[PDB]
Amino acid sequence: KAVVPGPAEHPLQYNYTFWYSRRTEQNIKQIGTFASVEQFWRFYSHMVRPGDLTGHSDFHLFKEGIKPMWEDDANKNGGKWIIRLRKGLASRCWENLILAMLGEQFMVGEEICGAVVSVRFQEDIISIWNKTASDQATTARIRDTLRRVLNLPPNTIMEYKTHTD
Amino acid sequence: PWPEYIYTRLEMYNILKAEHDSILAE
């Protein structure tokens, strides 16, 4: 029953799991788990882009075995970089973020937990979660990578929040 | 050591292109 790359597929460094929630634990529901770039695109092709939703919603993309909640053992001592977005940016930013995460672009070893895009009333929020909030070398490198892969204006505000706060 | 499986953004999209075209049998 283990999810594994298919023949001739491009394997990922980790299995990942898509989740979603909609404001209407089991608030957050699994969509599916994938092991290769091809499986990722197949899953992705079925999902509405976050910019095409206007109701209170979230997508979560986390390493398999990590629940998208801070109480998870992998998240308990961690934190996240948060970027608030005016409407119209979330779809492209989400895609850029998860491609970077899946492709191991952050170069922080095992530290990445997952990514979230949140659709709110007059803004959207994108974030990337890591395991150790007190690891400044790691959080700084994640910040630098975000700057490079999101391609947002240079004065874009990013904020780091430790989960326990 | 580096991870085994590193993909640039362009490499991710190159794979998408391949996947898109596979409606024809090889």
Side-chain angles (χ1 to χ4, degrees):
Chain A
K1 194 69 177 170
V3 175
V4 296
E9 292 178 6
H10 292 76
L12 298 172
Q13 185 71 20
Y14 304 88
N15 277 351
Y16 289 81
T17 299
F18 269 118
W19 309 67
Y20 76 107
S21 42
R22 278 196 147 282
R23 185 164 179 271
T24 55
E25 185 281 332
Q26 246 296 319
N27 220 321
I28 311 182
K29 318 210 176 62
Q30 294 184 44
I31 293 170
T33 297
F34 54 88
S36 67
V37 183
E38 288 85 346
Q39 288 169 23
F40 158 70
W41 285 120
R42 292 169 193 155
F43 268 102
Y44 190 63
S45 77
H46 290 290
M47 295 174 72
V48 173
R49 312 243 296 186
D52 298 353
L53 304 168
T54 65
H56 190 292
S57 319
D58 304 79
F59 287 145
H60 325 249
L61 181 56
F62 275 70
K63 291 175 170 174
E64 184 184 32
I66 305 183
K67 299 188 296 296
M69 73 200 76
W70 83 271
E71 298 94 342
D72 187 282
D73 282 355
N75 300 317
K76 203 164 304 188
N77 297 117
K80 61 188 181 184
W81 279 103
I82 295 121
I83 302 118
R84 301 184 180 269
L85 303 171
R86 65 170 159 90
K87 291 291 186 180
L89 298 175
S91 288
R92 289 164 116 214
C93 288
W94 176 237
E95 188 165 306
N96 286 341
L97 179 61
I98 63 183
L99 289 189
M101 179 174 62
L102 297 185
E104 288 295 307
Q105 291 295 311
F106 289 87
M107 303 272 86
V108 291
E110 294 176 349
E111 273 288 312
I112 301 304
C113 299
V116 180
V117 56
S118 298
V119 176
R120 298 297 183 258
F121 182 66
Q122 277 167 341
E123 67 182 1
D124 304 310
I125 308 172
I126 195 167
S127 58
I128 181 159
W129 297 27
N130 72 290
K131 300 195 175 181
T132 312
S134 61
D135 183 352
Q136 300 173 92
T138 285
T139 57
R141 175 166 289 180
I142 294 175
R143 185 204 52 233
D144 292 351
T145 306
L146 281 179
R147 205 186 58 86
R148 162 172 76 84
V149 301
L150 292 189
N151 196 36
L152 291 169
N155 71 341
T156 295
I157 294 170
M158 311 188 182
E159 180 185 353
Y160 192 86
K161 289 187 185 180
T162 302
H163 291 316
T164 54
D165 305 346
Chain B
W2 279 4
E4 320 233 339
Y5 299 111
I6 299 173
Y7 302 99
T8 65
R9 173 143 92 227
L10 179 57
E11 286 173 330
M12 298 292 282
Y13 285 116
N14 286 345
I15 298 170
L16 173 65
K17 165 184 183 190
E19 178 77 3
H20 177 287
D21 299 345
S22 60
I23 65 112
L24 294 182
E26 301 181 0

